[PDB]
Assembly symmetry: D2
Homo-oligomer: 476 residues x 4
């Protein structure tokens, strides 16, 4: 289990090939755009060594201590243990950090437990899992092709190598060229270039699954506009510390060593990877715990805002808060059923129930925009009446303490709260979270079509056919 200091030293020593506004980022641990999230990830690692949480966040094995997200669960109790670790980490950042490493560790853990799925590359998968686990490395990932001409398949873009494709194979490995559209949280040691969780691979040239150090020659991470509002925790309570960053991933004829290849030119293996290995189930397990944490945060802020300005006395405000409570209970329910109905897959890996998790990941993208809307409807103008800590410290401070106090809340506390509510919804950082919730697991349109096609609808159709027997009997 890594400490925060080790993580920081690792990034400083071998930083990811990040680019920000046309320039290479030499040290993300001190760069204004990245130092915040780096400190945040470091704090998550440090929590693993806090006596109060060590038993929750890590497990011992043969004289070593590993992060819980690497635990191959054998019982429902083990599954619950993984869930508690997901939740504890999520709560540290109010569920605002969407790509903490444990999500991807869940994927690799499942891939390893179900390694036989990968055939000749099985050992590579098992060895990679042990590597990430033993070193407790941080990972980032990118599964989608560049958004260029969505009317055509991967092989029908303006160039054969817009998507990441194999240029050639050598005795050392494969050379790939192309790009992945999005990778969140590039402040990692490794990047996972895996198949989509729902879209078809299309052609063998693109049917790939491999991992690389983020400093690999030819590999580039091009950052989007930064959303860090500033460093003041009062003025920017969340963007000052949880801005994970999103980036386009470029592969300029990058060499991928054979030991890092997990799938090569096999469309079928790519198209069934997450479902067959159980990675889909486990990664979605981290997600349901994460969204439960996020919903709890919104509930707390909504309640405090309403009480803070005396709006809680109005029925419709109470109803809006109750709506968030209903959604919170829904997510807790999916989480519980996912663990309680868990069963072993074809490789003997215990996986949480897909029905419950498909329910959660397809319902939350609909619930989140409404939860966000609720905060807007409760806060109203209070959400944009955001003086700075500098204003409270300035000449008009006394006036602000009078005009911005709450029903029974001091002005500084009131503004601190609304600054947080704003950062969770209306700042560039907050608004991005909305788009993130709507799309991170895939396009809802195709996620729903996917659910329709994979779900076993026969039992329900049969019950209706049986009910209709009496209807057709009138013709006998």
């Amino acid at each position: 289990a890594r400490t925060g200091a080790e993580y920081i030293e690792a990034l400083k020593t071998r930083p990811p090939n990040l680019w920000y506004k046309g320039e290479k980022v030499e040290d993300p641990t001190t760069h204004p755009v990245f130092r915040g999230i780096v400190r945040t990830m470091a704090a998550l690692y440090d929590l693993q060594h806090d006596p109060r949480y060590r038993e929750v966040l890590t497990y011992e094995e043969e004289g070593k201590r590993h992060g819980m997200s690497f635990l191959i669960p054998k019982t429902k109790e083990d599954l619950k243990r993984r869930g508690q670790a997901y939740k504890l980490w999520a709560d540290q950042n109010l569920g605002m950090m969407g790509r903490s490493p444990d999500y991807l560790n869940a994927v690799v853990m499942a891939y390893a437990a179900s390694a036989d799925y990968f055939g000749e590359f099985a050992e590579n998968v098992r060895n990679y899992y042990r590597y990430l686990r033993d070193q407790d490395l941080a990972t980032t990932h990118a599964l989608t092709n560049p958004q260029v001409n969505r009317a055509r398949p991967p092989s029908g873009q303006p160039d054969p190598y817009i998507p990441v494709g194999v240029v050639k194979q050598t005795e050392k490995g494969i050379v790939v060229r192309g790009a992945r559209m999005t990778a969140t949280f590039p402040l990692a040691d490794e990047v996972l270039i895996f198949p989509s969780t729902l879209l078809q691979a299309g052609s063998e040239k693109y049917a790939l699954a491999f991992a690389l150090p983020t400093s690999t020659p030819g590999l580039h991470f091009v950052c989007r506009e930064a959303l860090v509002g500033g460093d003041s925790p009062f003025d920017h309570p969340l963007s000052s510390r949880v801005e994970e960053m999103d980036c386009l991933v470029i592969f300029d004829d990058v060499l991928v060593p054979w030991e890092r290849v997990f799938i090569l030119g096999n469309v079928e293996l790519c198209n069934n990877a997450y479902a067959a290995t159980g990675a889909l189930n486990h990664m979605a397990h981290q997600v349901v715990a994460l969204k439960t944490a996020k919903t709890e945060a919104f509930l707390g802020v909504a309640a405090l805002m309403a009480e803070g300005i005396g709006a809680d006395v109005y029925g419709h405000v109470q109803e809006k808060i109750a709506e968030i409570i209903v959604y919170l209970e829904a997510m807790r329910a999916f989480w519980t059923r996912a663990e309680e109905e868990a069963k072993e897959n074809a490789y003997g890996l215990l996986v949480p129930d897909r029905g419950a998790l498909d329910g959660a990941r397809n319902l939350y993208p609909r619930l989140y925009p409404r939860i966000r809307e609720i905060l807007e409807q409760i806060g109203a103008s209070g959400l944009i009446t955001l003086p700075s800590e500098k204003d409270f410290k300035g000449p008009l401070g006394p006036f602000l303490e009078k005009f911005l106090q709450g029903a029974a809340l001091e002005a500084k506390e009131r503004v601190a709260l609304f600054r947080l509510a704003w950062d969770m919804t209306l700042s560039g950082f907050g608004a991005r979270q909305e788009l993130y919730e709507r799309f991170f697991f895939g396009d809802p349109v195709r996620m729903y079509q996917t659910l329709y096609n994979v779900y076993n609808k026969e039992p329900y159709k049969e019950r209706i056919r049986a009910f209709l027997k009496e209807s057709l009997k009138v013709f006998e």
Copy 2:
């Protein structure tokens, strides 16, 4: 455990004081408006003796066999057993029968297990429970006051006795006068006149809880317009058998024997009855199982309709069906968590988790109208192109077999299916089901306000206050 024949004989011998269109109903077992639902309830009772389901629907105790809905659960396994019985009964009618007796048995079971709550009337409650159980009697109930002037409390209506109130007390019992607005499924032996599950009692004169035989002198059940479309199972697959009927309940100075009184003039006891006894938890448990069954039925019909007319090839149709699947999984999740997180209440009664059940009963009223809408959007004109079995049997039958066949479905089967879809959504019977789902457990506006006030929001508010400590530290 009662048989269907015993139930039918009981209603024929001592029929409820029903009125339909200005006339007394002498025999509901043969009356055109009621014989269908009577046969349906009789079939539910008969199922208790079917070897295939006897172990699911009943339990043995001291040489006797009782209906599962009377079982006082001691373990989570017992809770699961009650749930399986709720589900099996619900599936028989595609979740379209909303007031089967087991819902109210859950209430009385909890009242009895928590009988100490009722003080001096505790024995009356325990004895009544044993009575309903031993005789396996059918019950109906009415908890709301007449909808006259909702701007005023129960004591502020045009007359003191519009709501049911105590006129006087005697050595034999109490005399009550007034009315209850709605009682569904009056084809029962007993009627429960209990407090509201969310509204305050208002005044001691109305703070009551008692039970009476449905044939009691002075007691009248005034039926609304019947929604039975006909007796043909082809033409009216559901309304011909599951029209439970709704009625206004009138009390013309009715005498309630002291042994049938459970609460008298105690506003506090009325206002906390369901929550304190656990009746709220158990009755909501029957509901979540029931709505899961109902959603499964809609999923089956939606899938069959789409496949039937070849609409399943369209993405948005697949998405609509997947939406129903998401809702089905949500209800299954609430159900699972309700049982898995069950704990004993103050009286030692094991009760299913209120959070999960409050989630289910406050979310489904929102989901159902959408599920209904989905069927409409899939079926389109097929939902009103409803020839009768008589048309298929007539001169134009051959033409109908050609023009109303489906992609790979025969015409008679196609129309049988759409007749069912129509009866589940657009017939008078189907449309009522929508209003029922929206309101049966209470007015959503006040159900949400109730949830807001009772829910413990402190943990979430505290997490936010803790997060804001760093914000306020900038002023130190």
Copy 3:
């Protein structure tokens, strides 16, 4: 201009070839299922001769009086006159009659004014228009193909003649075989078998447009389940008089005389018929006036229900009623702009603005279900507490007058109102109205795709490109 008596005599003398439950309907003017709507249509005709409305509903020309819906408008004032007639007729039935003849007269009027569009069949169109006008005949129509396998085109169904297609041509006319899925209000003298307003014709064999007397040999109208609740105006205020009926239209090798053919085997002419002639604009004009009338009716009922039970004192109830007001104003706005921005088409026919009408017909299908929902949310249990006039006339009448009175409303008036609200939303008749609003003008999915493709989006795209010039200048 026809009188009601003339209409009734015409149907009695030469009734449409209607079938109900396997039997031919000999006299729809006296048949229990149809006499109500027949009397309603007769009343609309009679209104044309009422001194108070004669100038609104008819116009004089060369010694004759014609129905306003036949007026070929030359000025915006004439357009307004047509609109006022649409509205006056609609108000008679609270906007619940969706297929009154004036909707189709608008179509034929436009077809005639733009007759050159039809080439060699131009004279047939002009003559048919004069025929309908002079005789003031009632029409019904069917534009859709049987819902069998929607995954395939008209030419890909189980049989070439499932859709109406030409079998052969003779010296007398054409022989057609097949069926149309739906025709509402078959209590007419003529039936219009025209092209779709948005779907492609597919093949020349089906590219048709013709009209026939409803008594034509080989032509059959197969009625769906009747939705007439009864004849009591108290118990069934709307279904007793406005049940238009829907039916499948069968063509058993029907001969269509050459003089009744308007389009034959021309896919292009079929695909552009309504837009090119202006029929789309005019028929949608009747619709916007009709939906404005319907919304006014719902507003009135919602307001009366809220006041009736004292629910109007609650904020959210006031908000729901205000929502209906917003929708009413939206429809009035579309109506006004449709007339004020009217311009002449390629044939010199003044047509109301398509933008405003496309807005109205694509927005109302979304607004109506919500308007219906609002009535449900306001009425609650009052919507199913529906005793009959027979109950008020019976022994319990006195009790009902006490328990079902409103805040300041007598019981009989209260129940009459809720019976109406129920008939507008939850009776089989009311529920059908919802499906009708959702689909009558076409499938929303394809109506929206149609709007996207036909709308000129260039002006807006150009404004954005211009705005972006400054963005690209940074690279100069």
Copy 4:
């Protein structure tokens, strides 16, 4: 009519008493946070002198040229002229500038035309109007009280002077103390401290209406967190130029000269000010034109994004764009009816129809969040894949030109477009626009309650009562 240079010189010479992060803003024309919007307002003024638009934006009177927003309309044509000016100005900034001066000029124009309403202060109003008109000054306004304890009225806050109240009256004028919660676009010469458009004044101490130079001693504007993303038009196409700024307005015992007082201590006059004068109608007229412009901008961006990435080939994407078209037509319709149904008020001032405008201002707050959502659903990950112009100018430029090109769109143009879409929806600037649309004209909850209470519902209730006469006749 002012030129941009005159406006800039005026702000530089006598700047508003602005505060940003604890410091006074000495020159907003050069300050990084305000120079953008100042240049934007200056450009609006300059447009008044462009030969192409002079006749649209100004009118001549007695040798002078005045801004169109000051024109007292005498005919519907004049009303249309005002509307065209509103639209032309709005289009310059894609409808993103919500508080351009013409909105408030509409208010003052109406106040002046209906000056008799103000009694003894009538001349002050007329003189102030002439002042703003002749000097073509820019105004800002604040109508709401500090959000402190919304459970209590203005007189029930923690201090009597939290809301702006009269401290004392002298021979020179009145001294006021307190604050207004929000004023958008404080880069103005004058500030209007007027009554609410829907909330009651509460007490005479707060029933005020006056105007002051923004440099008045004791008057302070405390700015919220700035949302200017940067100065690059490529990177921040909108926030670099249209960030109007919102601020809390503080009154530290400010002296208001008697000539600047329009209403003093008259609750009734305050509560009916906008409706009686017609200011409500005219200010809402500017709004409907503005929202039409805004919707046109979103339509253009949505269409370009869809075409840009080839997503336009998908049905649901076409449907989403068509949805925006429907909303655009709805707003155009409200606009048209508002002008066409205009009538003179009690003071002889021609005012646009309130029904149409109440419809528009109560419907758009519901439509906008959906329009914003649509852009998110179309753009998906493209909305956060935002490299900078600096990245295109840097070493990886060539790679970006390959991976971020569109179907038939160059990469730089593609990113410029998505940067704009992002700035319109997800940047801090874009997100604020959503909250703005939801609340600028008032809290929807109370706006709807206001509409319910003021609307004449009698005609609709009467039509229903008339329809029910036949129902009650059954008892005769």
